[model samples]
Target chain A: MRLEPEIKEFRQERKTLQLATVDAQGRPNVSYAPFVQNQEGYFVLISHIARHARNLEVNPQVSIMMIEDETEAKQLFARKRLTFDAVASMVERDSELWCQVIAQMGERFGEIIDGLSQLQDFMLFRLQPEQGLFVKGFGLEH
Target chain B: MRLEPEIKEFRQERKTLQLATVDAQGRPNVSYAPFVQNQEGYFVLISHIARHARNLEVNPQVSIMMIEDETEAKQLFARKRLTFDAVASMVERDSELWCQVIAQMGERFGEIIDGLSQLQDFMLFRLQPEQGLFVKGFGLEH
Candidate 1:
């Protein structure tokens, strides 16, 4: 299915996304991560120190939401948002995709990625979108 | 443990929260809702038509995150936020607590709630937080 231009723009404008992943026990965990998106998927650099990174390793199926900022919303109940059900795969360190994504992150997030990229604990995961829902407001859903 | 003043204030300032719940198949879902909180827990009026509502019936265990807005954040990677591990229970419609909560929602959300309260498809759920994590920024956590 073709992604609507508005939905694509909404996803591009956001710098972070809310993530949901299930643990080995089938318990769900919610967290946020700064990400860079491309045709392949959403790329996130996360640390092993976080529970979400461990959960991703155990269960690759995940859900992600990129939401409108509250301060900029017209209404609290109907914030514009895009949600995606994705499958995550770790980008091998020093691989072609990893180097490219790390460079993109450096450009978007500045020097922080430069330092973070060097950290052994940090791993990159590409969340490939399988399906998505775009909610514009109360009565507008796509 | 005593709730820190800063964490309490952060929770109070936000009108909506991001929710995470697991389906019977163990897949996770992420969504958001406007909420109100009291000593008992966070109360959210949602629709049976939504997937989160159905997930709640199959598994009461849930996780919630109230986050700093993107436009208001000093750093995308380290936005101030709060997350909780909670248990969800459906509030019977027209029950005393339900009526009270609906009244509260009406006052907070205005006349919209008045119309919504009459919708049979809508249901209320109280999410009782068991434990919480407060992240104030990159290096500040409570």
Candidate 2:
């Protein structure tokens, strides 16, 4: 699915964004990591690796967002956080797209991706969204 | 680790948050999802049945934050996202604490937690943060 230009803009420019997902207990897991660009599709390097990858097999639903850093002066309800719902799909290691993805990773993160080994829990995944919502400060919904 | 009382207040109160993780490609996959609690000793849950869980397994290192919603037409340079570094630990389903946790789910979420077989789908997890940083609006780190 095509991301809205505004959402895409937030993702493209942000050095790092927050990614949220749910485990079985109905609680959220959050992580802050680098953002990657590949023909406009954005996802965490999570690629079906370890435990998180296994969990996605059961529940493919997920959300991702980018919150610009907070300002010096704090506001009672200053806003920051853009969230979107996503559906995850995994690709086999042997696929041609896998090679391209690795190249992209090498380009963006360089040597970091090289350390990746098959047993190192490497695999490709994409979160395709069914719905999305953007939230800002003070419980504002966009 | 014990969370500062002040920190606990934010987790208990904030409504929206950001989550980030690395996908298999070494790229970042960031998404939004609900969490059980964000308080001190934040314990997030996940499904052993989910892929994100697998992602965490490969690399338990993660970052998450809970923030208040933003609402304003004005271009207020506000930052309300909390950035964090965390690790995940898998809980044994047969443990007494697991039993109690499952029971607690019934109280909090009603009948949803009663089915033992269905419980298989729910993977209990805990998020242990090595350190946490809070930003009201960013300039000075609290």
Candidate 3:
């Protein structure tokens, strides 16, 4: 039950996610994803045929990080951040859920969603966080 | 071969890195680390007995991301980011290079480095990026 106002505010205001996935050889790959939190509170990411998407094909486990900007950071050692342990699963591109998700993305991204929806390699993923932590500067991590 | 000026400027200005490591079960874990670039530009991070540290003990292959914050981002999908494919190796606590690395961390973190150096399970790692990519915006990655 994510009830933290900070988490809610930051999640809504910050639109990018640093997503981590594992490769076939067990190496980790990190990618930046623009995401929208859907009605169920799952982080929905639109991915392409990039290294991260390929890695997700082999591995569904991911870790996500949302961090404050450098200008807003009070301390480098413990910037305000939120980290999530999550699992990812692809959604059917032609399913009703996909249409709903795309419409949600359209609300945040406007016309870009239209361009993305037409791409062949573009895919949708639902990242469900199993556990999360919020850190507020050094030694004050929650 | 890393010739991007934006990469150089951003690296110099940012102190925190989002590090991804794979666990024994091949799950990827992302953690925030306050890093100092060594003489050879390898990322030096001091980690504790956390899940990410345990992951590093079993797997040395890691990926790291340095990203621009929301304030600097012009677009959600095109947020500036840099990703690296890196190899991690532990620094022997008593080694000369370990001493050099801790001294450098001390300068930035003050006495916290001394406290961290004495902890048995607090380890130091050198992350050498074999290759990297810089993205100025969407589709402008190099």
| Per-model TM against the reference | 0.92, 0.44, 0.85
lDDT of 3: 0.75
What are the Cα lDDT values of the candidates?
0.84, 0.52, 0.75
- Classified by CAPRI criteria, candidate 1 counts as high
CAPRI grade, predicted model 3 = medium
DockQ computed for model 1 against the true two-chain complex using alpha carbons: 0.81
Question: On residues A38-98, what C-alpha lDDT tens digit does candidate 2 reach at each position?
Answer: 6636645554443456655565656666565433214212334566666766755757766
Query: In model 3, which regions exceed 4 Å deviation?
Result: A1-3, A131-142, B1-3, B109-111, B131-142
TM-score of candidate 2 to 2 decimals: 0.44
Per-residue lDDT of candidate 3, residues A1-142 (tens digit)? 2446656777788777777788887789877687888665555555566888878777788888777776787666556767878878888887888888889988987998899888878898888877765455333243
Residue lDDT tens for model 1, B1-142? 2347766677767888899899898889998888988766788988788888889877988888888898888777778887888999999999999998998888878988988789987889999977765465423353
The reply for model 2, stretches above 4 Å from the true place, is A1-9, A24-27, A47-51, A71-76, A117-119, A133-142, B1-142
By TM-score, the best candidate is 1
**TM-score winner, 1 or 2:** 1
In candidate 3, how many Å is residue B61 off?
A: 0.9
- lDDT, candidate 3, B1-142, per-residue tens: 2446656777777767777888887788777677888665564555565777778778888888777777876666766667788888888887988888888888876887787789887888888878766455433353
Model 1 chain B, poorest ten-residue lDDT window?
Answer: B133-142
Best by lDDT: 1
